[PDB]
Design a protein around this ligand. Structure first.
Ligand SMILES: O=C(O)[C@H](Cc1ccccc1)n1c(SO)c(C2CC2)c(Cc2cccc3ccccc23)cc1=O
Ligand SMILES: [Co+2]
Lengths: 216, 147
């Protein structure tokens, strides 16, 4: 019943808070919306350095509301030259029916929450994902992410269509890291990633021997 | 419009046929259970709306852009969920459209779909304890993790 207005959140570290809109899309019955944050290991945090308020709220049928994300003074202990990962969680509590022999389903939405320090603040539509490097290795590619940001890779194929629709196990690269993925060899690799807005652009790569970088 | 403010993919809202998001499981299936079978199957459909779930070549679930998990208290075995209420001797089992059985807290495998809908099938099973009919039930979490 209860829904969230985005599939990832970016927290701009130049500010102290932001809000996410939520909705009870069920027009018949009230639902409760519980909110909380988890760290990079999906372990629940409560006192900081990011908090979600209110932790619980009743949404009347069809009601629209918000959840606010705020930082605490301990946010300054996070690195200021790369993103830190959190997860934002929105779990509903459906109205209890006292109906005999029923299974009731309660949706939980869990999205990535990227804390993005002021020193790496981005402009609308800025692309850093074109800095990815692909290295051919046995059975696949070692992908390098030299950037300060998390990068979520959702496709890799020999054409734009294969990047968009081919079978590929999503992988997310931490800032300044590398990860090997299983893959066939592609003469001109195309790679798809998910951007801040939930869109899925495709990048075209050219290879020199085993190393591949985005077509200039 | 060439010029406009930021527009983002919303998270999916879950919709069921029943306003309470409940599936009626039926009377405790004692006679089936004693014969050594599971009780009758009950289908339920979770429609995932507002998130442009389908794309030209696939959809968020099949392509692993979302990952889904059934959350609950595990029953007698990994393949089973515990039930609350007065009944005894029973657990719940959930399966996807290819017969993959959900395990509490374990992500469901990504498969191609057969509808904006995810379709599951539940059934009541034995849990090893003495069967005692009565009412039962459970609240299960359906957790959608966004890539
Ligand atoms: O006991 C219950 O079944 C209900 C659940 C419920 C409530 C509204 C719509 C659908 C389901 N419940 C619930 S759900 O167990 C709670 C929240 C879990 C704590 C509260 C307390 C509560 C409700 C709404 C807003 C609140 C704000 C601050 C503190 C408590 C709040 C009162 C409460 O009655
Ligand atoms: Co536009």
């Amino acid at each position: 019943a209860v829904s969230l207005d985005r599939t990832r959140a970016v927290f701009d570290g130049s500010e102290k808070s932001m809000t996410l809109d939520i909705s009870n899309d069920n027009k018949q019955l009230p639902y409760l919306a519980q909110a909380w944050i988890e760290n990079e290991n999906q372990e629940k945090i409560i006192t900081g350095p990011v908090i979600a308020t209110p932790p619980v709220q009743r949404l009347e049928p069809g009601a629209k509301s918000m959840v606010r994300l705020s930082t605490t003074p301990d946010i300054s202990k996070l690195p200021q030259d790369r993103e830190s990962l959190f997860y934002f969680n929105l779990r509903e509590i459906p109205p209890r029916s006292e109906k005999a022999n029923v299974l009731q389903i309660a949706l939980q939405t869990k999205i990535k929450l990227f804390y993005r320090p002021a020193a790496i603040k981005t402009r609308p539509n800025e692309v850093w994902q074109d800095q990815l490097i692909l290295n051919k290795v046995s059975g696949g590619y070692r992908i390098e992410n030299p950037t300060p940001y998390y990068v979520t890779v959702i496709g890799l194929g020999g054409s734009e269509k294969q990047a968009e629709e081919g079978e590929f196990e999503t992988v997310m690269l931490s800032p300044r890291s590398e990860q090997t993925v299983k893959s066939a060899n592609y003469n001109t690799p195309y790679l798809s990633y998910i951007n801040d807005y939930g869109g899925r652009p495709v990048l075209s790569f050219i290879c020199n021997g085993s190393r591949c970088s985005v077509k200039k | 419009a060439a010029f406009h403010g930021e527009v983002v993919r919303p998270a999916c809202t879950l919709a069921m046929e029943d306003a309470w998001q409940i599936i009626d499981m039926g009377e405790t299936p004692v006679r089936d259970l004693q014969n050594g079978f599971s009780g009758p199957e009950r289908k339920f459909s979770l429609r995932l709306r507002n998130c442009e779930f389908n794309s030209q070549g696939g959809n968020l679930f099949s392509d692993s852009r979302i990952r889904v998990t059934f959350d609950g208290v595990r029953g007698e075995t990994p393949d089973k969920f515990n039930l609350s209420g007065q009944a005894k001797g029973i657990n719940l089992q959930i399966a996807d459209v290819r017969g993959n059985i959900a395990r509490a807290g374990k992500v469901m495998p990504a498969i191609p779909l057969t509808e904006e809908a995810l379709d599951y099938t539940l059934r009541i099973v034995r849990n090893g304890k003495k069967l005692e009919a009565g009412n039962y039930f459970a609240v299960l979490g359906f957790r959608v993790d966004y890539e």
